[PDB]
Design a protein around this ligand. Structure first.
Ligand SMILES: *[C@@H]1O[C@H](CO)[C@@H](O[C@@H]2O[C@H](CO)[C@@H](O)[C@H](O)[C@H]2NC(C)=O)[C@H](O)[C@H]1NC(C)=O
Ligand SMILES: *[C@@H]1O[C@H](CO)[C@@H](O[C@@H]2O[C@H](CO)[C@@H](O)[C@H](O)[C@H]2NC(C)=O)[C@H](O)[C@H]1NC(C)=O
Ligand SMILES: *[C@@H]1O[C@H](CO)[C@@H](O[C@@H]2O[C@H](CO)[C@@H](O)[C@H](O)[C@H]2NC(C)=O)[C@H](O)[C@H]1NC(C)=O
Ligand SMILES: *[C@@H]1O[C@H](CO)[C@@H](O[C@@H]2O[C@H](CO)[C@@H](O)[C@H](O)[C@H]2NC(C)=O)[C@H](O)[C@H]1NC(C)=O
Ligand SMILES: *[C@@H]1O[C@H](CO)[C@@H](O[C@@H]2O[C@H](CO)[C@@H](O)[C@H](O)[C@H]2NC(C)=O)[C@H](O)[C@H]1NC(C)=O
Ligand SMILES: *[C@@H]1O[C@H](CO)[C@@H](O)[C@H](O)[C@H]1NC(C)=O
Lengths: 595, 98
């Protein structure tokens, strides 16, 4: 009966909140002060949380799921009843964890040695990522691109084939058709009177939104190709694809390292307020106190006053071994801490606004039950953090926060320099993200057999992304598995939808703050009505369907690409005038070796 | 490490009458199945403990409460406020209260 499930969850909601607390408090003491008497302090305290949750999970199947009427207590029950693994045979369950540990340690400890000196050998993160991000030598970028895929990616090919079979068995025992349908279960919504969403409906909404970005991406692809021919003459065709090893990093995920070759007006400095911070003696604490004044300006609460003692805003005065990585912690019981090692720079002035945005999202849904204290889907949590960073990087906000000469002149040449640096990171990553999840979805359902994995991968690079390989690759390579998110078992569609939600939030908040100009000049400071539009979504958590959360801000029930294109229309107008003598589009027949 | 000595009751058959008190420790029975003094599904111990810890956000830290309740049965009198006294002005037509 349904009233027994309510009494089940309230014993759960008070044993979990304490056991999650000290399992996360011990993870704080390891992260900010590393010993090994802290790693053993967090492994036993971490396993008491994991052993407790599988005990309550096997108690949750005593209650049926379709004999429930209240939507909230049904949502908590389905998130706890989830079997996930453990549906496999107990010798297949230990084979799967052996593969996931072997693929993870090949990616982090794989070395590449030089053919002129076999005694010097580079790892990926120090040394191989620096070549792909800084070099202008064609022959050295071609060496680092091919040798990472032929010496490390060939080890992951027999391991990734066994990984697909075991993950499809686990997904079909949980009544999905494949493992790709298991990943799309985040966006599913069942029976809330007009807000429903199918797991197959996500596939059409991604492909419908993508064919409206292809006019903008084609003009960006044509402008970068014309600028890369001056940097690498006799290597690039003026009507063809771009070679895969000249894109700024190892995989071509972000084009953000191509800015020094593709800058529109290099005689205008892109605005940088780092010298005005060290001329006014701003400490470590000023960067967060101006960040807290931004959020109280819009109508959001202060920091919790436990935030100021418990947090560790710099690396300590001790030479203290403590993972230095910006992050926002939500230990529980209303205890919010930020861990970062901040330097006096406009870079960490902006990520301070980003990391505080995770905190203000966390402080808002802290009145829901324990199992609904996440973002409404996997994409909302990063998207609310980046609309705080866009509004703080504007020169309108910088001159009113005291950091820009009240006699500063923004010209139309510097807005093109700023918008093109945004499009190399935002627009340049959208066909990469769409192509990769489309390839992984077709591998799991079996539309691509294993004798055509690397054949269909490079046909989709030339057609969707416009990127050609420099050396042909047969079915002994596995080039997707040489990325971190593929070999470490992570979903990748959250980076596509976060980019679309980010400009839907920003365009909906700037109509409430009564903006008049272009969308990229907007700032939501001093408003109250925009914050009330934002706070009505922030407090929902997972208690409502995410389509119901979007109408509280945007006014629509689906993700939309038209606010993303309105942000880049000053660039799209300027790009169509720079490509009057160029060719827009590419040919899938040209190759850098096929002459 | 958590002060686990401060408990509260989280299951009862029926809400309390005003100023009523209940220190029993019988195993609660949520479902219809009888409990027979042992724990299990739908048979819960009725007391939980605040695990208080010094690094808790406000609203999670312990507050001490005192409830004063003045009652007036039907006696002849009892405790009350204090009494203020001024100075005695000797020699002058005065308005006095002794
Ligand atoms: C890292 O934290 C641990 C524990 O928080 C520190 O180790 C000991 O902590 C106790 C407190 O319970 C002290 O009485 C001991 O003196 C600490 N050990 C030592 C060797 O000092 C540890 O000190 C912290 N790390 C550093 C570098 O201070
Ligand atoms: C079941 O649904 C009802 C409404 O559909 C929820 O009722 C609300 O409960 C809160 C506190 O529990 C009250 O403050 C509200 O006034 C109630 N609303 C109404 C309309 O009466 C109820 O909370 C849900 N059950 C659970 C366990 O959350
Ligand atoms: C979870 O996996 C189990 C198999 O281990 C599935 O079958 C359940 O088996 C248990 C006994 O171990 C029964 O109590 C359940 O009734 C069975 N399933 C149900 C509730 O029909 C079970 O179907 C899986 N649960 C999910 C999430 O589908
Ligand atoms: C920035 O604004 C100036 C001012 O309008 C633009 O200069 C004009 O450019 C057009 C097209 O080349 C000419 O027909 C006008 O005669 C120019 N104006 C003047 C006063 O000379 C300039 O092109 C703009 N730059 C960008 C990048 O948009
Ligand atoms: C936006 O908010 C800021 C912060 O309160 C306002 O800045 C104040 O501006 C006045 C006059 O411009 C100064 O006298 C104050 O010293 C400023 N305050 C601070 C804390 O620096 C700003 O005026 C607001 N914008 C509008 C349009 O009202
Ligand atoms: C936030 O804190 C400041 C001082 O730190 C205070 O003046 C302000 O009133 C606080 N905000 C609210 C809503 O009380």
């Amino acid at each position: 009966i349904e009233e027994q499930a309510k009494t089940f969850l309230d014993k759960f909601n008070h044993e979990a909140e304490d056991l999650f607390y000290q399992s996360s408090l011990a993870s704080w003491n390891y992260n900010t002060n590393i010993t090994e008497e802290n790693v053993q302090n967090m492994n036993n305290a971490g396993d008491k949380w994991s052993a407790f949750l599988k005990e309550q999970s096997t108690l949750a199947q005593m209650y049926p799921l379709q004999e429930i009427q209240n939507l909230t207590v049904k949502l908590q029950l389905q998130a706890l009843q989830q079997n996930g693994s453990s549906v496999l045979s107990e010798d297949k369950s230990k084979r799967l964890n052996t593969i996931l540990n072997t693929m993870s340690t090949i990616y982090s400890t794989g070395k590449v040695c030089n053919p002129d000196n076999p005694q010097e050998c580079l790892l990926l993160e120090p040394g191989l990522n620096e070549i792909m991000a800084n070099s202008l030598d064609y022959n050295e970028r071609l060496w680092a691109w091919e040798s990472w895929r032929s010496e490390v990616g060939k080890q992951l090919r027999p391991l990734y084939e066994e990984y697909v079979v075991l993950k499809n068995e686990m997904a079909r025992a949980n009544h999905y058709e494949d493992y790709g349908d298991y990943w799309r279960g985040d966006y599913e919504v069942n029976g809330v009177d007009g807000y429903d969403y199918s797991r197959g409906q996500l596939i059409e909404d991604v492909e419908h939104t993508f064919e409206e970005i292809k006019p903008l991406y084609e003009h960006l692809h044509a402008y970068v190709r014309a600028k890369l021919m001056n940097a690498y003459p006799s290597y690039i065709s003026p009507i063809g694809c771009l070679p895969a090893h000249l894109l700024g990093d190892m995989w071509g995920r972000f084009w953000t390292n191509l800015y020094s070759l593709t800058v529109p007006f290099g005689q205008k400095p892109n605005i940088d307020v780092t010298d005005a911070m060290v001329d006014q003696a701003w400490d470590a604490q000023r960067i967060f106190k101006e960040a807290e004044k931004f959020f109280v300006s819009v109508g959001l609460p202060n920091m919790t006053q436990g935030f100021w003692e418990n947090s560790m805003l710099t690396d300590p005065g001790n030479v203290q071994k403590a993972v230095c990585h910006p992050t926002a912690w939500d230990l529980g019981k209303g205890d919010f801490r930020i861990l970062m090692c901040t330097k006096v720079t406009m870079d960490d002035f902006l990520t301070a606004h980003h990391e505080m945005g995770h905190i203000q999202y966390d402080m808002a849904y802290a009145a829901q039950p324990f199992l609904l204290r996440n973002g409404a889907n996997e994409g909302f949590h990063e998207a609310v953090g980046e609309i705080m960073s866009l509004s703080a990087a504007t020169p309108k906000h910088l001159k009113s926060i005291g950091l820009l000469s009240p006699d500063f002149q923004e010209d139309n040449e510097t807005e093109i320099n700023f918008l093109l640096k945004q499009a190399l990171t935002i627009v340049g990553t959208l066909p990469f993200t769409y192509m990769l999840e489309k390839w992984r979805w077709m591998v799991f359902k079996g539309e691509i057999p294993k004798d055509q994995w690397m054949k269909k991968w490079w046909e989709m690079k030339r057609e969707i992304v416009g990127v050609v390989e420099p050396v042909p690759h047969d079915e002994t390579y596995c080039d997707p598995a040489s990325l971190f998110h593929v070999s470490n078992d992570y979903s990748f569609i959250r980076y596509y939808t976060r980019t679309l939600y980010q400009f839907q939030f920003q365009e909906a908040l700037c109509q409430a703050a009564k903006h008049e100009g272009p969308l990229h000049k907007c700032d939501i400071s001093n408003s109250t009505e925009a914050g009330q539009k934002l706070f009505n979504m922030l407090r929902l958590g997972k208690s409502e369907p995410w389509t119901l959360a979007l109408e509280n801000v945007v006014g629509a029930k689906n993700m939309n690409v038209r606010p993303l294109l309105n942000y880049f229309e000053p660039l799209f107008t300027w790009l169509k005038d720079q490509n009057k003598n160029s060719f827009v589009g590419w040919s899938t027949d040209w190759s850098p070796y096929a002459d | 490490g958590g002060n686990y000595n401060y408990l509260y009751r989280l299951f009862r058959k029926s809400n309390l009458k005003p100023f009523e008190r209940d220190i029993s420790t019988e195993i609660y029975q949520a479902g219809s199945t009888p409990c027979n003094g042992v724990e299990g599904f739908n048979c819960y111990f009725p007391l939980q403990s605040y695990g208080f810890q010094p690094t808790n956000g406000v609203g999670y830290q312990p507050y001490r409460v005192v409830v004063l309740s003045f009652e007036l049965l039907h006696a002849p009198a009892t405790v009350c406020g204090p009494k203020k006294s001024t100075n005695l002005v000797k020699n002058k037509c005065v308005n006095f209260n002794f």
